[PDB]
UniProtKB/Swiss-Prot annotation, chain A:
L-glutamate binds at E34. The modification Phosphoserine is found at S25. The postsynaptic actions of L-glutamate are mediated by a variety of receptors that are named according to their selective agonists. This receptor binds AMPA (quisqualate) > L-glutamate > kainate. Coiled coil: none annotated. The M4 transmembrane segment mediates tetramerization and is required for cell surface expression. Detected in forebrain. Detected in dendrites of neuronal cells. Expressed in the pyramidal cell layers of CA1 and CA3 and in the granule cell layer of the dentate gyrus. This is Glutamate receptor 2. It is found in: Cell membrane; Postsynaptic cell membrane; Postsynaptic density membrane. Ionotropic glutamate receptor that functions as a ligand-gated cation channel, gated by L-glutamate and glutamatergic agonists such as alpha-amino-3-hydroxy-5-methyl-4-isoxazolepropionic acid (AMPA), quisqualic acid, and kainic acid. L-glutamate acts as an excitatory neurotransmitter at many synapses in the central nervous system and plays an important role in fast excitatory synaptic transmission. The chain holds residues 693 to 741 of 883 of the full protein.
Curated annotation (Swiss-Prot), chain B:
One of its GO terms (cellular component) is cell surface. It comes from the Eukaryota. It is a multi-pass membrane protein. It is found in: Membrane; Synapse, Synaptosome. It is linked to Defects in Cacng2 cause the stargazer (stg) phenotype. Stg mice have spike-wave seizures characteristic of absence epilepsy, with accompanying defects in the cerebellum and inner ear. The L-type calcium channel is composed of five subunits: alpha-1, alpha-2/delta, beta and gamma. Interacts with the PDZ domains of DLG4/PSD-95 and DLG1/SAP97. May interact with GOPC. Acts as an auxiliary subunit for AMPA-selective glutamate receptors (AMPARs). Found in a complex with GRIA1, GRIA2, GRIA3, GRIA4, CNIH2, CNIH3, CACNG3, CACNG4, CACNG5, CACNG7 and CACNG8. Interacts with GRIA1 and GRIA2. Interacts with MPP2. Keywords: Calcium, Calcium channel, Calcium transport, Glycoprotein, Ion channel, Ion transport, Membrane, Phosphoprotein, Synapse, Synaptosome, Transmembrane, Transmembrane helix, Transport, Voltage-gated channel. GO terms for biological process: eye blink reflex; membrane depolarization; membrane hyperpolarization; nervous system process; neuromuscular junction development; neurotransmitter receptor localization to postsynaptic specialization membrane; positive regulation of protein localization to basolateral plasma membrane; postsynaptic neurotransmitter receptor diffusion trapping. The lineage of its organism: Eukaryota, Metazoa, Chordata, Craniata, Vertebrata. Regulates the trafficking and gating properties of AMPA-selective glutamate receptors (AMPARs). Promotes their targeting to the cell membrane and synapses and modulates their gating properties by slowing their rates of activation, deactivation and desensitization. Does not show subunit-specific AMPA receptor regulation and regulates all AMPAR subunits. Thought to stabilize the calcium channel in an inactivated (closed) state. Belongs to the PMP-22/EMP/MP20 family. CACNG subfamily. The chain holds residues 3 to 214 of 323 of the full protein. Its main location: membrane. One of its GO terms (molecular function) is voltage-gated calcium channel activity. The gene is Cacng2. This is Voltage-dependent calcium channel gamma-2 subunit.
Length: 49, 189
C-alpha cells in the first residue's frame, strides 16, 4: 500500500536499471529483488551494494 | 598609541588596505589550487564564484562553480542546503566588504563635525563586525570545500584583510577612549 501510493513511481523497467538507480540514490532507494541476483551484484565492482 | 594625526592617518590607511584586500579576495579567482574538471581532471585554481583551469588542455576556461549540481544531486538536509546557499551567495565575505566600506565612510566623516564622538565608536564596531564576518566566511568556505589541495593568494589576502580590520577597529576604539578621556579631563579642570 506504500508502493501503490508513492510518487514518483518506485517500480523500475529492468533489474539493471533498478540496480543503477540504487547506486544513483545514495541510500535513498531500496531494491526488492531475488536473493541470488542481489548477491551476484553485491559480488561485482564497485561493490557499493 | 601616540598623538592624533599619526593615529588618524594610520587608521585610515589600514582601513583602506583592508577594504582593498577583501575586495581583491572576493573579486579574484585564486583561492584553492586543486584537481578537477574545468569544463578530464586537471589542475584548476578556484575562487568564490568561478574556477579557472590551470595548466589544462583548454587553459583559461573560467567556468562557474557547480554550487547546486544537477544529475541526481541526492538532495541535502536543511543545514547542508543552508551551508551550500551561504557558500554560493558568499553573503559573509560581501558583508565583511560592505562593513569595511561603512567603517571607512564613518572614519572619513569623522573629519567633519569632530564634536560627535560616537561616529568613531560606530566605525570600530563596524570593523570588528567585518572581521567576525570574515571569520565566518572563511569557516563556511573551508567547510564547503571539504564535502591534495592548496590555498591561493586571495585566501591569504582575505586573512590579512581580517587581521588588518581587527587592528584598525582596535585603533578606532582606542581613539574613542582617548577622545572621551580628553573630554573628561577638560570637564574636570
Amino acid at each position: 500500500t506504500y508502493m501503490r501510493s508513492a510518487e514518483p513511481s518506485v517500480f523500475v523497467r529492468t533489474t539493471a536499471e533498478g540496480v543503477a538507480r540504487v547506486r544513483k540514490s545514495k541510500g535513498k532507494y531500496a531494491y526488492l529483488l531475488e536473493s541470488t541476483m542481489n548477491e551476484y551484484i553485491e559480488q561485482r565492482k564497485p561493490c557499493d551494494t | 598609541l601616540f598623538d592624533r594625526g599619526v593615529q588618524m592617518l594610520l587608521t585610515t590607511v589600514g582601513a583602506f588596505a583592508a577594504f582593498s584586500l577583501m575586495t581583491i579576495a572576493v573579486g579574484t579567482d585564486y583561492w584553492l589550487y586543486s584537481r578537477g574538471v574545468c569544463k578530464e581532471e586537471v589542475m584548476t585554481h578556484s575562487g568564490l564564484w568561478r574556477t579557472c583551469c590551470l595548466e589544462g588542455n583548454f587553459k583559461g576556461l573560467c567556468k562557474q562553480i557547480d554550487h547546486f549540481p544537477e544529475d541526481a544531486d541526492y538532495e541535502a538536509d536543511t543545514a547542508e542546503y543552508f551551508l551550500r546557499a551561504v557558500r554560493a551567495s558568499s553573503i559573509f565575505p560581501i558583508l565583511s566588504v560592505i562593513l569595511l566600506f561603512m567603517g571607512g565612510l564613518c572614519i572619513a566623516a569623522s573629519e567633519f563635525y569632530k564634536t560627535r564622538h560616537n561616529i568613531i565608536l560606530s566605525a570600530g564596531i563596524f570593523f570588528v563586525s567585518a572581521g567576525l564576518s570574515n571569520i565566518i566566511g572563511i569557516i563556511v568556505y573551508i567547510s564547503a570545500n571539504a564535502g591534495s589541495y592548496s590555498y591561493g593568494w586571495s585566501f591569504y589576502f582575505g586573512a590579512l584583510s581580517f587581521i588588518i580590520a581587527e587592528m584598525v577597529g582596535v585603533l578606532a576604539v582606542h581613539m574613542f577612549i582617548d577622545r572621551h578621556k580628553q573630554l573628561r579631563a577638560t570637564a574636570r579642570a
